[PDB]
Amino acid sequence: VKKLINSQISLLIGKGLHEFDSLRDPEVNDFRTKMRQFCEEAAAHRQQLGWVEWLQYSFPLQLEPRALLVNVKFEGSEESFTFQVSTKDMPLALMACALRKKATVFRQQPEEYALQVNGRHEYLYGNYPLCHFQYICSCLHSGLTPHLTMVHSSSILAMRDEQSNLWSLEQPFSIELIEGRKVNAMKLVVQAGLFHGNEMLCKTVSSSEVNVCSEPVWKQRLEFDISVCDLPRMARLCFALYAVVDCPIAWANLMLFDYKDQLKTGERCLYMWPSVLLNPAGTVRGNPNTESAAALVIYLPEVAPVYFPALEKILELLREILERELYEHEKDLVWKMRHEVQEHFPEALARLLLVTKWNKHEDVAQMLYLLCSWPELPVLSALELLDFSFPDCYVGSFAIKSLRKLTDDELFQYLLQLVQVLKYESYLDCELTKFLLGRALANRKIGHFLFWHLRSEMHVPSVALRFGLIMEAYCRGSTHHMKVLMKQGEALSKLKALNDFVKVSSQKTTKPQTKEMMHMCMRQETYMEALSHLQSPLDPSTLLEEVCVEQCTFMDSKMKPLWIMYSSEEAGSAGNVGIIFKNGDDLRQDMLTLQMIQLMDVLWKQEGLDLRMTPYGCLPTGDRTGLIEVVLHSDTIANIQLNKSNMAATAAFNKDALLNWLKSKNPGEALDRAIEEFTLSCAGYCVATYVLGIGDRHSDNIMIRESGQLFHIDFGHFLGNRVPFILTYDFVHVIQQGKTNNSEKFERFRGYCERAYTILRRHGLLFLHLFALMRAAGLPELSCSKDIQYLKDSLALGKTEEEALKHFRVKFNEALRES
Numbered sequence: 036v037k038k039l040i041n042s043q044i045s046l047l048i049g050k051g052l053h054e055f056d057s058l059r060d061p062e063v064n065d066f067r068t069k070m071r072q073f074c075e076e077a078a079a080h081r082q083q084l085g086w087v088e089w090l091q092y093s094f095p096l097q098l099e100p101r102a103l104l105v106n107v108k109f110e111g112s113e114e115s116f117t118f119q120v121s122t123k124d125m126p127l128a129l130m131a132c133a134l135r136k137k138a139t140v141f142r143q144q145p146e147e148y149a150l151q152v153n154g155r156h157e158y159l160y161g162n163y164p165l166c167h168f169q170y171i172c173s174c175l176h177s178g179l180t181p182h183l184t185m186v187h188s189s190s191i192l193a194m195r196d197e198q199s200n201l202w203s204l205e206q207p208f209s210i211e212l213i214e215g216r217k218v219n220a221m222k223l224v225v226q227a228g229l230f231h232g233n234e235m236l237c238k239t240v241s242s243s244e245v246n247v248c249s250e251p252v253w254k255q256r257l258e259f260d261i262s263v264c265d266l267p268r269m270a271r272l273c274f275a276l277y278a279v280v281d282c283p284i285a286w287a288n289l290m291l292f293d294y295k296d297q298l299k300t301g302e303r304c305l306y307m308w309p310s311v312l313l314n315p316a317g318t319v320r321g322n323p324n325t326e327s328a329a330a331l332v333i334y335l336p337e338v339a340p341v342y343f344p345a346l347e348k349i350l351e352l353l354r355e356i357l358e359r360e361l362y363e364h365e366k367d368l369v370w371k372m373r374h375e376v377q378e379h380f381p382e383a384l385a386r387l388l389l390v391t392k393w394n395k396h397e398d399v400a401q402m403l404y405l406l407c408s409w410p411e412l413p414v415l416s417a418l419e420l421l422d423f424s425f426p427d428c429y430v431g432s433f434a435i436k437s438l439r440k441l442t443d444d445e446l447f448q449y450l451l452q453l454v455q456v457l458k459y460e461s462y463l464d465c466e467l468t469k470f471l472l473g474r475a476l477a478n479r480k481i482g483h484f485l486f487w488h489l490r491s492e493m494h495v496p497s498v499a500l501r502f503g504l505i506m507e508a509y510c511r512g513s514t515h516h517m518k519v520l521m522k523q524g525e526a527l528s529k530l531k532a533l534n535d536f537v538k539v540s541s542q543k544t545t546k547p548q549t550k551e552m553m554h555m556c557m558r559q560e561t562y563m564e565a566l567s568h569l570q571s572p573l574d575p576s577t578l579l580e581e582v583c584v585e586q587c588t589f590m591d592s593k594m595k596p597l598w599i600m601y602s603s604e605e606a607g608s609a610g611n612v613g614i615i616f617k618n619g620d621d622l623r624q625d626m627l628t629l630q631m632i633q634l635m636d637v638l639w640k641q642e643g644l645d646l647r648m649t650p651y652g653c654l655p656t657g658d659r660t661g662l663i664e665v666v667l668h669s670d671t672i673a674n675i676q677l678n679k680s681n682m683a684a685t686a687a688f689n690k691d692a693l694l695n696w697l698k699s700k701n702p703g704e705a706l707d708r709a710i711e712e713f714t715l716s717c718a719g720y721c722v723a724t725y726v727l728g729i730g731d732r733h734s735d736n737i738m739i740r741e742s743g744q745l746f747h748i749d750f751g752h753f754l755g756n757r758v759p760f761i762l763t764y765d766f767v768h769v770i771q772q773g774k775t776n777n778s779e780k781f782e783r784f785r786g787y788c789e790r791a792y793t794i795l796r797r798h799g800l801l802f803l804h805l806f807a808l809m810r811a812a813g814l815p816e817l818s819c820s821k822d823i824q825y826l827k828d829s830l831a832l833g834k835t836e837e838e839a840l841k842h843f844r845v846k847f848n849e850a851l852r853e854s
């Protein structure tokens with residue numbers, strides 16, 4: 036039976052476990068073994084969780100950063116009770132009324148129950164007011180009634196049990212460039228370099244020119260200007276093979292120490308990766324395609340059986356003005372006064388690490404000595420220390436320790452970045468991986484998105500091995516969740532097949548007939564079973580039950596993305612949800628953008644500013660494949676501004692097209708609120724697109740909800756890849772209630788944008804650190820530091836608050852006149 040588990044893991048993660056064994060790699064063998072035990076311990080520790088502690092695992096509380104209707108029922112019968120509680124009351128008080136009424140009806144304690152949202156994997160519990168749970172707030176703003184279900188602890192325990200599995204070497208370092216066998220048309224050079232992060236340990240050495248028609252020989256010694264004893268634990272030997280008369284050919288990196296801290300000897304064949312000159316941030320593992328990849332055979336001198344010194348023998352061995360790059364005389368000053376840093380400037384650790392002589396072991400030993408006695412840093416400081424610019428393992432481990440105090444909501448917000456950092460790791464076994472795995476096994480919602488973040492990039496060879504092992508390890512921690520995720524993969528597998536059929540059919544057949552054929556294909560037994568009854572990959576708390584084939588369709592645009600609607604006779608209206616399956620686009624940029632907008636939303640509302648944003652879900656699931664959450668009861672600006680006849684939004688002037696639409700959806704007194712929702716949401720996405728630099732904003736990639744809420748879609752383009760600010764007049768026409776003159780509901784809108792802009796400025800370092808880590812993703816519009824510089828200037832983080840606010844209004848003033 037252990038085999039089927041092994042078999043469905045292989046099917047799930049998208050690569051056979053036999054391939055792991057086929058490598059015969061001791062490092063791989065150690066990773067799988069060591070973490071299988073760790074995840075199985077967490078599995079046995081998880082199930083020791085009491086029934087309440089189990090709720091916190093499987094269904095973590097969804098909290099947002101006067102009376103109301105609430106109906107509640109029990110699991111046994113479908114007979115219901117509608118109570119009238121306040122938004123102040125605890126779920127306990129509500130459960131008390133539910134039991135008391137049940138008593139009265141049937142014959143005649145609340146702590147033994149939990150409130151489940153109808154038809155969703157979301158629960159209401161704890162000592163929180165009802166208006167703290169986001170489901171209740173979602174009902175308050177929608178005007179719907181919260182339908183809850185009294186779930187006893189005995190059935191919750193049933194849910195639990197059902198998921199059941201030397202400094203002596205002072206001679207110069209050097210190598211032996213032997214052979215390899217390439218491809219080009221001239222002469223050829225091999226430039227090698229030693230790196231500790233993004234900067235060199237010493238001066239790079241180049242090979243001697245050797246003819247192209249080769250498969251060559253060099254057998255040339257490359258002596259580096261650095262002692263062997265001074266090689267840091269995380270030193271990288273980076274090669275660069277290129278032709279010259281400059282045409283780059285290939286690159287390859289290598290650690291000088293294995294995962295067992297042993298100095299490497301001797302000969303090694305380096306299967307290089309194609310290029311675009313040195314690439315120090317690249318992977319340290321060779322090209323898996325050993326058939327086509329050019330190799331580079333080197334040899335490492337036997338300098339003795341030496342290992343990198345244990346930490347125990349390492350421990351043996353004008354500033355405030357320049358606190359906001361640095362000059363050499365300033366670096367000297369920071370390093371000289373390094374003890375005062377630890378004592379009085381604890382969070383200035385990053386700066387102190389950047390002035391540390393990493394090419395000299397004595398300076399590193401002293402630095403590591405201070406780090407071992409260094410006070411815990413805030414989350415924001417630790418996020419910076421995760422970057423590749425701090426490649427030392429003990430530093431990366433220290434940053435992890437400062438991130439152990441991450442709340443699950445914080446971790447969820449930063450998870451995308453933390454996963455991309457795994458690409459900076461030099462070894463499979465690292466503190467970051469175990470932290471991610473540990474938190475994923477403690478929180479099913481974290482584990483859900485951790486999986487899909489790894490599974491989405493299994494098509495990428497340089498991370499296929501690492502991500503595949505981590506997912507396998509997680510599966511050991513929960514065989515049940517593995518089955519749940521596998522149900523999601525089978526649905527996505529059918530959607531892929533369905534979309535291929537739609538793509539082909541729509542090119543040789545009209546849309547209505549294609550949509551008709553789409554329906555017939557979906558009505559197949561294998562499609563009905565695969566696409567139904569599953570946890571939405573976009574949101575595991577959202578259940579996708581019965582698929583409404585009649586409500587399913589596709590768009591006439593390039594990739595013909597699918598529109599799949601769902602319904603549930605258990606969730607009521609909260610079950611009528613939809614997903615958008617798109618195949619062909621790199622949805623990674625949309626996910627990042629929407630996550631950052633979501634972050635802005637959190638930062639705004641925990642300051643008391645609810646700009647009524649619509650951060651819909653967007654999750655890449657495979658190679659240029661992913662899902663997008665359907666925003667119900669909405670429409671694009673362009674479709675509304677079509678001024679379609681025979682309707683209610685038909686206007687005498689195109690200016691009134693959008694305003695007439697709102698009044699048709701919000702009759703009478705309901706209008707005034709829709710105007711506000713529009714005004715708030717407009718100011719939000721406005722500031723959001725300016726900061727993130729989202730250009731190409733037109734009426735086709737901008738939508739509006741019937742409640743009035745304005746929201747943007749299809750973010751392929753951020754960080755100006757320089758974008759001015761984007762204020763069209765028809766939106767202003769709505770904000771000013773239609774009248775051409777309306778200063779106070781416009782200046783108030785102006786105040787909305789400015790406050791929303793200043794709030795993001797104070798959290799500017801958060802956006803800087805997160806984007807810096809996201810450079811590891813390999814996103815085309817986020818690779819160089821000039822993309823980062825854009826965010827610096829959009830937030831004006833080098834300037835004072837009113838200096839930036841003054842400048843912020845300048846472009847605001849420019850946007851209103853070209854309007």
Ligand SMILES: Cc1c(F)cncc1-n1c([C@H](C)Nc2nc(N)nc(N)c2C#N)nc2cccc(Cl)c2c1=O
Pocket residue numbers: 588589590595596597598615616651663664665666667669670671674748749
């Ligand atoms: C084009 C369009 C429209 F004019 C009005 N409403 C919806 C559409 N529309 C859209 C729009 C443009 N995109 C979105 N629409 C909603 N409601 N929520 C979103 N999160 C997004 C997004 N991103 N995408 C599709 C993707 C596939 C198949 C179809 Cl069949 C449609 C489709 O119809």
